[PDB]
Write an enzyme that holds these catalytic residues in place. Structure first.
Site, PDB file in Angstrom:
ATOM      1  N   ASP A 197      -0.160  50.781  -0.786  1.00 52.19           N
ATOM      2  CA  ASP A 197       0.737  49.895   0.062  1.00 52.19           C
ATOM      3  C   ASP A 197       0.103  48.486  -0.052  1.00 52.19           C
ATOM      4  O   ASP A 197       0.959  47.272  -0.230  1.00 52.19           O
ATOM      5  CB  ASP A 197       0.645  50.331   1.371  1.00 52.19           C
ATOM      6  CG  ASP A 197       1.349  51.812   1.679  1.00 52.19           C
ATOM      7  OD1 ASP A 197       2.341  52.068   0.600  1.00 52.19           O
ATOM      8  OD2 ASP A 197       1.083  52.260   2.611  1.00 52.19           O
ATOM      9  N   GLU A 198      -1.286  48.288   0.018  1.00 50.85           N
ATOM     10  CA  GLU A 198      -1.947  47.061   0.072  1.00 50.85           C
ATOM     11  C   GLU A 198      -1.340  45.980  -1.201  1.00 50.85           C
ATOM     12  O   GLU A 198      -1.433  44.884  -0.975  1.00 50.85           O
ATOM     13  CB  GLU A 198      -3.328  47.188   0.165  1.00 50.85           C
ATOM     14  CG  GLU A 198      -4.171  46.074   0.647  1.00 50.85           C
ATOM     15  CD  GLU A 198      -3.904  45.593   2.017  1.00 50.85           C
ATOM     16  OE1 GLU A 198      -2.869  45.182   2.571  1.00 50.85           O
ATOM     17  OE2 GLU A 198      -4.667  46.237   2.727  1.00 50.85           O
TER      18      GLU A 198
ATOM     19  N   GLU B 189      -6.012  41.039   2.781  1.00 53.18           N
ATOM     20  CA  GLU B 189      -5.524  42.134   2.182  1.00 53.18           C
ATOM     21  C   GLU B 189      -6.053  42.387   0.660  1.00 53.18           C
ATOM     22  O   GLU B 189      -6.322  43.310   0.354  1.00 53.18           O
ATOM     23  CB  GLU B 189      -3.877  42.136   2.038  1.00 53.18           C
ATOM     24  CG  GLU B 189      -3.538  42.636   3.583  1.00 53.18           C
ATOM     25  CD  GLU B 189      -1.780  42.759   3.559  1.00 53.18           C
ATOM     26  OE1 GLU B 189      -1.345  43.481   4.236  1.00 53.18           O
ATOM     27  OE2 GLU B 189      -1.164  41.696   3.151  1.00 53.18           O
TER      28      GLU B 189
ATOM     29  N   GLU C 278       1.749  49.082   7.997  1.00 57.26           N
ATOM     30  CA  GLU C 278       0.146  48.993   8.791  1.00 57.26           C
ATOM     31  C   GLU C 278       0.128  49.828   9.850  1.00 57.26           C
ATOM     32  O   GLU C 278      -0.813  50.437  10.003  1.00 57.26           O
ATOM     33  CB  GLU C 278       0.103  47.490   9.427  1.00 57.26           C
ATOM     34  CG  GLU C 278       0.309  46.235   8.027  1.00 57.26           C
ATOM     35  CD  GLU C 278      -0.764  46.582   6.919  1.00 57.26           C
ATOM     36  OE1 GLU C 278      -1.414  47.554   6.885  1.00 57.26           O
ATOM     37  OE2 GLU C 278      -0.967  45.858   6.221  1.00 57.26           O
TER      38      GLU C 278
ATOM     39  N   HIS D 132       1.384  44.574  -0.329  1.00 58.05           N
ATOM     40  CA  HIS D 132       1.450  43.583   0.900  1.00 58.05           C
ATOM     41  C   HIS D 132       0.541  42.278   0.197  1.00 58.05           C
ATOM     42  O   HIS D 132       1.479  41.032   0.549  1.00 58.05           O
ATOM     43  CB  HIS D 132       0.386  44.230   1.977  1.00 58.05           C
ATOM     44  CG  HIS D 132       0.711  45.456   2.414  1.00 58.05           C
ATOM     45  ND1 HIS D 132      -0.034  46.040   3.503  1.00 58.05           N
ATOM     46  CD2 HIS D 132       1.967  45.778   2.443  1.00 58.05           C
ATOM     47  CE1 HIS D 132       0.732  47.164   3.734  1.00 58.05           C
ATOM     48  NE2 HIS D 132       1.885  47.161   3.537  1.00 58.05           N
TER      49      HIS D 132
ATOM     50  N   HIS E  99      -0.959  53.003   8.686  1.00 60.18           N
ATOM     51  CA  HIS E  99      -2.474  52.912   8.243  1.00 60.18           C
ATOM     52  C   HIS E  99      -3.344  53.207   9.341  1.00 60.18           C
ATOM     53  O   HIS E  99      -4.273  54.239   9.418  1.00 60.18           O
ATOM     54  CB  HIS E  99      -2.770  51.629   7.667  1.00 60.18           C
ATOM     55  CG  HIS E  99      -2.116  51.365   6.076  1.00 60.18           C
ATOM     56  ND1 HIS E  99      -2.104  50.214   5.526  1.00 60.18           N
ATOM     57  CD2 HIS E  99      -1.185  52.260   5.680  1.00 60.18           C
ATOM     58  CE1 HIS E  99      -1.266  50.401   4.238  1.00 60.18           C
ATOM     59  NE2 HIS E  99      -0.607  51.567   4.443  1.00 60.18           N
TER      60      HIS E  99
ATOM     61  N   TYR F 207      -6.121  56.104  10.065  1.00 62.47           N
ATOM     62  CA  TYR F 207      -7.557  55.812  10.528  1.00 62.47           C
ATOM     63  C   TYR F 207      -7.704  56.920  11.716  1.00 62.47           C
ATOM     64  O   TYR F 207      -8.921  57.149  11.941  1.00 62.47           O
ATOM     65  CB  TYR F 207      -7.913  54.562  10.576  1.00 62.47           C
ATOM     66  CG  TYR F 207      -7.720  53.699   9.394  1.00 62.47           C
ATOM     67  CD1 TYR F 207      -7.111  52.546   9.110  1.00 62.47           C
ATOM     68  CD2 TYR F 207      -8.247  54.356   8.342  1.00 62.47           C
ATOM     69  CE1 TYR F 207      -6.962  51.609   8.058  1.00 62.47           C
ATOM     70  CE2 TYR F 207      -8.377  53.668   7.079  1.00 62.47           C
ATOM     71  CZ  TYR F 207      -7.636  52.369   6.834  1.00 62.47           C
ATOM     72  OH  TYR F 207      -7.710  51.546   5.671  1.00 62.47           O
TER      73      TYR F 207
END
Ligand SMILES: [Cl-]
Ligand SMILES: [Cl-]
Ligand SMILES: [Cl-]
Ligand SMILES: [Cl-]
Lengths: 349, 349
Positions: free
Chosen positions: B237-238, B204, B115, B241, B118, B122
């Site tokens: 990735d999500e 998620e 995360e 998760h 991530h 951003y």
């Protein structure tokens, strides 16, 4: 005293373009001004039918458009339909009774005819992208913004037509009609014609090019591509139409054709400059209407207004008027891809 | 009584996932639940750095966007940045002190770490498309709509963390703290964990997928393509998760891991269903905010809200909850192109 076949055997090469003996013989072996014969031949060579263009995939595109993009597209389409509803009839009704050389008379009839094809093409587009065309066609008459433009543009024609009738019926002089004075003056009638032609030049050379930018902005996005194929054909014709009126205006003001028109064109030069500036301001206010709920990729109010200034300067220069706007480069050079033909220069230069 | 190295030599294969002896030895030769070891290995295999992605051409695209399309794009980016600011820290702070098996402890640390990548990505996007990133980052905290979501989501974590501290400091029972009663109940703490995990699953599995649809809608238009390359990596990735929390939730409610959790999951099944429905309603209200000044080609409020219903039904089914919405097909099948990896199923099935 309009006559559909004047009996005097006149030398058509020595008549003025306008206000001379009405044309008797339609002959095309000689011209006073061969530009008009060249324009006829080009327009004939461009003859197209709107159903030649498949606009099927434009219905899907249009339905997918966000509401403000539909608004831009359909407002632009309605305005074009208004303008060529007028251009369909008006050159014939307003100019034919004034023309005294055959090449110009036939050019005007060819021009007007080609406008009916444009109107027919707008019907083809409309009926293919909306479920109820009547809504669209009715809004052309009732829409507040469109009506304001219709009123100004039509007045140049309407006033020339009315005065022309008085000239034909009463001839030059001061007259009594139901107990009021009516002054018919050829000089004033010549001024009405000149202004009307200046207005028609601004219509085809500026107002329609603003509209083309809107249509081709969708095509740049690969949307409404059937519409854009039709507009390419329309724009190629429009390049002829505006050339025609640039020559009429320039020949009139040079004194070559009618020495009196030269003095009249000089008298009302400010009035013409003002008419052009007004038209440009109106197309900028129209941009503001198109984009009032948002713009789209590649075209917004600021860009379109720059293009109004850019094209207005070019067109005004071409008919000898001072430039109202600062010098600028083309804000949308991508438009020149769409405004190109091998057989005429379609884009402004 | 949290201990970073518990001295009892315990059989880690017989501990529950949560609330057992805190993990002493980090060993990876055996697992109670090999899903978590598989997720670690996958996430390690996916390791990427945001600067691997060229986002240079996204600045040009973003500047060309109409203002409402900037609004959609930047609001979506801010919301994602909010969510993974939270996801960066929160799994570690909230779950690590509760975990009693090594594979889950390491999965959570690997998850949280991924995360932070991530979040870093951003930042990479933001600093490349705006002139002043501070404006964006500050609006994430102050934006009325974003703050409402932050408040709900963070409360699930915050309440679990506070209660966890009381459990570690005071243990089970009824207690006196500065002259008031504090009841510490393992059963209530287990309920706090279960709800929090349900909330993180909705975050998620639903909230971020709604956001992906927004990002990939731009990519379908061939806009913001650097952003979209990054989101493809983020979405891959999500998928891990959310798989992780689906397994945590499902193992907890089955009774397999802790028979008491099974009864607790049954007690609060309505509360979970309601939390999920609430999250979905919030993502629909977010759609309304994104599109309040207009939509764009391929995505609007109506389409995005259908997608909320479609994905919510899938995710709720996967953790055993009743479906809140009518059955429906994927309203945006084009999204599955962007949600695909060879090494995990990225799109909902
Ligand atoms: Cl010849
Ligand atoms: Cl000149
Ligand atoms: Cl192995
Ligand atoms: Cl089940």
């Amino acid at each position: 005293a309009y006559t559909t076949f004047s009996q005097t055997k006149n030398d058509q090469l020595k008549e003025p373009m306008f206000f001379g003996q009405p044309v008797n013989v339609a002959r095309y072996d000689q011209q006073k001004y061969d530009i008009f014969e060249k324009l006829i031949e080009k327009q004939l060579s461009f003859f197209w039918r709107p159903e030649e263009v498949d606009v099927s995939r434009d219905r899907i595109d249009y339905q997918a458009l966000p509401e403000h993009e539909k608004h831009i597209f359909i407002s632009n389409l309605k305005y074009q339909t208004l303008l060529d509803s007028i251009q369909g009839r008006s050159p014939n009704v307003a100019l034919l009774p004034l023309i005294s050389i055959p090449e110009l008379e036939t050019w005007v009839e060819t021009w007007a005819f080609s406008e009916t094809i444009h109107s027919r093409s707008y019907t083809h587009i409309i009926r293919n992208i909306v479920n109820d065309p009547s809504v669209v066609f009715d809004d052309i008459v009732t829409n507040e913004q469109i009506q304001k433009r219709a009123e100004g543009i039509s007045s140049y024609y309407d006033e020339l037509i009315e005065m022309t009738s008085y000239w034909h019926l009463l001839g030059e002089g001061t007259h009594t009609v139901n107990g009021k004075t009516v002054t018919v003056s050829l000089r004033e009638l010549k001024k009405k014609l000149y202004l009307c032609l200046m207005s028609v030049n601004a219509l085809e050379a500026i107002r329609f090019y603003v509209s083309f930018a809107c249509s081709f902005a969708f095509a740049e996005r690969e949307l409404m591509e059937g519409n854009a194929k039709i507009i390419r054909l329309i724009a190629r014709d429009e390049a002829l139409h505006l050339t025609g009126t640039q020559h009429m205006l320039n020949l009139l003001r040079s004194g070559a054709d009618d020495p009196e028109m030269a003095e009249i064109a000089e008298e009302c030069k400010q009035e013409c400059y003002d008419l052009f500036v007004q038209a440009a301001q109106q197309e900028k206010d129209w941009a503001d209407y198109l984009f009032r709920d948002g713009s789209m990729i590649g075209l917004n109010k600021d860009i379109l207004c720059q293009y109004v200034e850019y094209i207005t300067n070019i067109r005004m220069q071409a008919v000898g008027l001072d430039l109202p706007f600062q010098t600028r480069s083309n804000p949308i050079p991508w438009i020149n891809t769409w405004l190109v033909s091998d057989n005429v220069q379609v884009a402004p230069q």
